[PDB]
A paper describes a structure:
The bromodomain and extra-terminal (BET) family of proteins, including BRD2, BRD3, BRD4, and BRDT, are chromatin reader proteins that bind via tandem bromodomains to acetylated lysines in histone N-terminal tails. BET proteins recruit co-activator complexes to chromatin to promote transcription of target genes. BRD4 regulates a number of genes essential for cell growth through the recruitment and maintenance of the pTEFb complex at gene promoters during mitosis. Chromatin readers bind to specific modifications on histone tails, translating the histone “code” into transcriptional effects by recruiting co-activator or co-repressor complexes to target genes.
Herein, we report the results of our studies using GSK1324726A (I-BET726), a novel, potent, and selective small molecule inhibitor of BET proteins. I-BET726 is a novel small molecule inhibitor that binds to the acetyl-lysine recognition pocket of BET family proteins. It binds with high affinity to BRD2 (IC50= 41 nM), BRD3 (IC50= 31 nM), and BRD4 (IC50= 22 nM), and competes with tetra-acetylated histone H4 peptides (K5ac, K8ac, K12ac, K16ac) for binding to the bromodomains of these proteins. I-BET726 is highly selective for BET family proteins, exhibiting no binding affinity for any bromodomain-containing homolog tested with the exception of CREBBP, for which I-BET726 binds with >1000-fold lower affinity than to BET family proteins. To determine if MYCN suppression is due to direct regulation of the MYCN locus by BET proteins, we analyzed recruitment of BRD4 to the MYCN promoter by chromatin immunoprecipitation (ChIP). BRD4 was specifically enriched at the MYCN promoter relative to IgG control ChIP in vehicle-treated samples, but not at an intergenic region on chromosome 12. Treatment with I-BET726 diminished BRD4 binding at the MYCN promoter in both non-amplified and MYCN-amplified cell lines, indicating that direct regulation by I-BET726 remains intact upon gene amplification. Taken together, these data demonstrate that I-BET726 directly modulates MYCN transcription by inhibiting BRD4 recruitment, and represses MYCN expression to a high degree regardless of amplification status. BCL2 down-regulation was previously observed with the BET inhibitor I-BET151, which displaced BET proteins from the BCL2 transcriptional start site in MLL-fusion leukemia cell lines. Consistent with these observations, we detected BRD4 enrichment at the BCL2 promoter in the SK–N–SH cell line, and treatment with I-BET726 abrogated this interaction. Here we show that a novel BET inhibitor, I-BET726, exhibits potent anti-proliferative activity in models of neuroblastoma, a solid tumor associated with a high frequency of MYCN gene amplifications.
Author numbering: 42 to 168
Amino acid sequence: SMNPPPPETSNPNKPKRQTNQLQYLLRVVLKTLWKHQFAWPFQQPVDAVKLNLPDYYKIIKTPMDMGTIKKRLENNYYWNAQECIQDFNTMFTNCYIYNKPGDDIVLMAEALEKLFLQKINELPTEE
Ligand SMILES: CC(=O)N1c2ccc(-c3ccc(C(=O)O)cc3)cc2[C@H](Nc2ccc(Cl)cc2)C[C@@H]1C
């Protein structure tokens, strides 16, 4: 089977900006999660060819990963923090939906999600 193309990371038809909250999401939140020992499976799109999981993209039609989120932040793709936070949650939700409750990857996602929530709890005021 084949992989789908990755989620778009820059769209010339879609308005772009930077906010101090989106800066915090890249510089503090994503940066902290990216170098966690459990981050690596989430640093790029799920590769259903490499993993030989032809049902992954039958079940998950809105994939998301931290590599995509990082690129989106780098490209000012998000207009606000809520769009970025939603993508992080889509990434976690996809993981919990596809994988079984006791799987290594689920425990890894749960650890990253706990840390994510700790970090976004101090999202700064908009300047
Ligand atoms: C995110 C998610 O739900 N899944 C996922 C995604 C990517 C990779 C993965 C990523 C990169 C490599 C690699 O660089 O070789 C290998 C596997 C693996 C997985 C998950 N598998 C897995 C991850 C970690 C450990 Cl310790 C054991 C099994 C399955 C799942 C589809």
